[PDB]
Amino acid sequence: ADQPIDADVTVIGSGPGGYVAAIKAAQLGFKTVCIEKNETLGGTCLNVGCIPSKALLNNSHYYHMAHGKDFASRGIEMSEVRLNLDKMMEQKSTAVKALTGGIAHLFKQNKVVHVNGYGKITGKNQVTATKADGGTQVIDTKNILIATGSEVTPFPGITIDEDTIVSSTGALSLKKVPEKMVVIGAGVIGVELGSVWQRLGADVTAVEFLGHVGGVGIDMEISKNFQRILQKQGFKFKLNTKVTGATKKSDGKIDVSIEAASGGKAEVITCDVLLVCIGRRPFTKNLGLEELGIELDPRGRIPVNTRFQTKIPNIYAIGDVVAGPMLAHKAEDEGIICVEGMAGGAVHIDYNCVPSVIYTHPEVAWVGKSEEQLKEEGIEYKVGKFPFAANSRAKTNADTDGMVKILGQKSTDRVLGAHILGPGAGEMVNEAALALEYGASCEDIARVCHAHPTLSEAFREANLAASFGKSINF
Amino acid sequence: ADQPIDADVTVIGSGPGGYVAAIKAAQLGFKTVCIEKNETLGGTCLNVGCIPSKALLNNSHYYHMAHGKDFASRGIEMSEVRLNLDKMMEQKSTAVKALTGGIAHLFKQNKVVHVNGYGKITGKNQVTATKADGGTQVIDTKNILIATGSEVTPFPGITIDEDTIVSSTGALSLKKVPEKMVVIGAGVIGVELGSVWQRLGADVTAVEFLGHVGGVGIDMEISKNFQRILQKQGFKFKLNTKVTGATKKSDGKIDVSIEAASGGKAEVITCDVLLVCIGRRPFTKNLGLEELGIELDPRGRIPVNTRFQTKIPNIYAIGDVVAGPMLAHKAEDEGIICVEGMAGGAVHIDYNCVPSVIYTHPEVAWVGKSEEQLKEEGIEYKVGKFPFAANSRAKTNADTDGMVKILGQKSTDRVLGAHILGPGAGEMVNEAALALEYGASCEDIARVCHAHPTLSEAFREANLAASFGKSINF
Amino acid sequence: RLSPAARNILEKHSLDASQGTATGPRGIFTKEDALKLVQLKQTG
């Protein structure tokens, strides 16, 4: 339209991948512009994913603590404990609102140029950004970086209205706690969200096609103990089970139609809300790739080479829309790296050392290979385990759930995988991550002085168990 | 019954490091015997120290949340938040009892012989344990290992009766929240215990000779910031002051005379309870060290060499009866590697990598050197900082207090000290320690992929800032 | 330059890495690395 803009790097999308790549590109002296179609920045991580659902599990956690037996049993005693869901929700949003302001502020600081509108490649060096009032902005650029992220994989036959039938993003804003509630899918997203409303007073049942809870690449042992723990809290699961369809009815209630994934024990669960959590797919709608001759992965992703280059060399792609785990830190990482690459630097990323975390309570975090991957691979390994019931910090806080499982290669004692089910798993898994990028051995990590008493100490004791054959406290 | 036994190693004490060496030794195949005078095992850490105090810091923190604005701002509304000290104290005794139970049980599976009684070294190869009632028990042993721990440092002309003038012990068992509390000494134990009762309703002032709160080695700038925070919570401090004496009044109260350390602007402070903690000292009485020609050093610790041996080669001392931080994780490691050395191996420990941690909230933790240790060493450094205010998980959690500060050697990017004030600090410093033991440089941490969203990201961001000029989120 | 264990276990075997060479990540002399120095002693 008006007056064409000039850029080195044009970043499409403003989520975790996009906003750091833009700032990094900036920090490196690139006339960077970042286009985002939405009102606020932060993409999905910040606005309808990570941060909300986290702010929400945090709150929902303290509630169950205060309403349950935990508090009364540690001296703190309340008359009654009601829940003010709107006040709770407001907490979450204030956090999000504050963070999204930050990103914008981070942009000014670095002289990143934020263009608002639904961008789309209209040249090998041009993208058109169009606001809905028909306004338009053309950037003439040297490189284009795509970070259009992802969307909900929708369930065919079941239409999400975002009211009584919802996705991640509607379950984050429930205007009230449902009585009964079903979750199609027991992945990290589903499990987390279900747990929130469970903790709040909802009777929650997840239905999964596969035979385990937690996502892919989770250890089957820690998955099963994990599921078991949720089952105790009140969560119910219906594994190896497919839905035929679900039906809305007179009085509002929803009727989902379940049946064995293989055989057929046709049953019918009836709830008040139905969260559909079956996956999430890359998002490239109207980017203009069909016309530049860029074919997609058969799963909707962009084929990029080692330096994150698409079939068209000056056009890269990174984050949810490209292969690898759909994680935020994972995108930030490709984001930075890809740019440092344009800059003329080396682009190595080790996808084995990318921590995975589920933030329920207890947390589940892991990094490296699981037992099943190590077998399928043909690798001779050994395992050491230290339960939190034996960890002092843990026992002292009356929170003794889970264990830390370490996988070390049988001969070189090289740590091949660390898996933590328990309190403080999310922050523990980073220490692991580190050790793993070092080619640590269970011995090395055991000779490190971990402070007492900490959750960490059980991470130490599990390697002590894997490299010597038994620990001191267990 | 009371009849000789023999062993390869006999260990005096069953504190950390005393009992851990006992267990370790047993598992390398020494016939070991652990003598302990108290009715329970675990030492001071487990009975009147670390564990019990962690139980209260954690319980009283959940009070300060339910009985303040926190819960309310999370939408957890509650009628009345009443305290039941009996019951909060009843969960702490619980933890301790369960934990000391555990040790008794470990000693059974590792076949460690437990002898109750006060042990005296009657000869280079003999220890004599005297029970409560004169009943004696002799042990002829190859090695004897001293781990008799530490005791309270008493304050010039003031007597702890553990009722109204208490030490750390007494403090952990107050019978009601004291209306006004005075604390002599703002070291770790100090702010820790003062903070528990300040959160439970008490009015605590902490008087300290030195110009900074938190113990020795704490970093000046984070000490100042730590102080600042604890002030806004209600914790009152009196720095560069000296207590000249205390007098116990008629109605029950206690009167402390305080005064400027420097000059002497005298003044009195009444209070209902005095907590005396100016320090701890190596405890070594009735051990028979004298008649053996082991002299102590002027601070009273047993001088040992590199393998932890005293002037008498088969007599080793470890734990806080010897030099180096009086910490539980330091005891445990010397315990471990002391016995490993008696069993032939290598005995090296690098005291520059043992963390420190203050379990208040915010937490404070560090490892490596401080700005002032570096500055007086003639070492050139550079600094990197990141406020938890700019951290995603802390912001989302309505917990944004503090910052991470890493010190790196100017020219070699090599990490020299890491310092954390903020949520999760204690666990975070363990990552730190792992990075130090690997002689890791700033950049090494910055490359590692930390899960999102987590506190640990602060730790990554601070290194990145120390290495490359600036971080991403700040 | 030496993983904790690598160093610890050189010491126990009264030798250093000036001989054998490094490997693994930040050119840190590995325990794998040291073990090989270890086995070259016996072998020898």
Ligand SMILES: Cc1cc2nc3c(=O)[nH]c(=O)nc-3n(C[C@H](O)[C@H](O)[C@H](O)COP(=O)(O)OP(=O)(O)OC[C@H]3O[C@@H](n4cnc5c(N)ncnc54)[C@H](O)[C@@H]3O)c2cc1C
């Ligand atoms: C419920 C939930 C919980 C989650 N929890 C975690 C977790 O705990 N840890 C974790 O690591 N990950 C978590 N994730 C996944 C994480 O959000 C993703 O890995 C991350 O959001 C991907 O970031 P991104 O930059 O690839 O893409 P996105 O966040 O998807 O951002 C893409 C952005 O681009 C915009 N956009 C798309 N196309 C265009 C266009 N053509 N023009 C302009 N703008 C466009 C979108 O509007 C969006 O802002 C969670 C996800 C969900 C929803």
Ligand SMILES: Cc1cc2nc3c(=O)[nH]c(=O)nc-3n(C[C@H](O)[C@H](O)[C@H](O)COP(=O)(O)OP(=O)(O)OC[C@H]3O[C@@H](n4cnc5c(N)ncnc54)[C@H](O)[C@@H]3O)c2cc1C
């Ligand atoms: C209030 C408080 C809070 C603390 N918090 C922390 C913290 O958070 N983190 C941390 O790292 N440290 C903390 N400490 C310090 C920590 O407890 C010490 O570092 C640790 O206790 C020392 O362990 P040890 O094995 O050296 O000795 P000790 O625990 O002192 O054990 C010595 C043992 O030997 C017994 N004994 C002594 N003489 C004899 C004898 N002659 N015969 C038989 N038995 C004998 C004693 O009865 C005792 O069991 C804290 C201390 C206090 C009191």
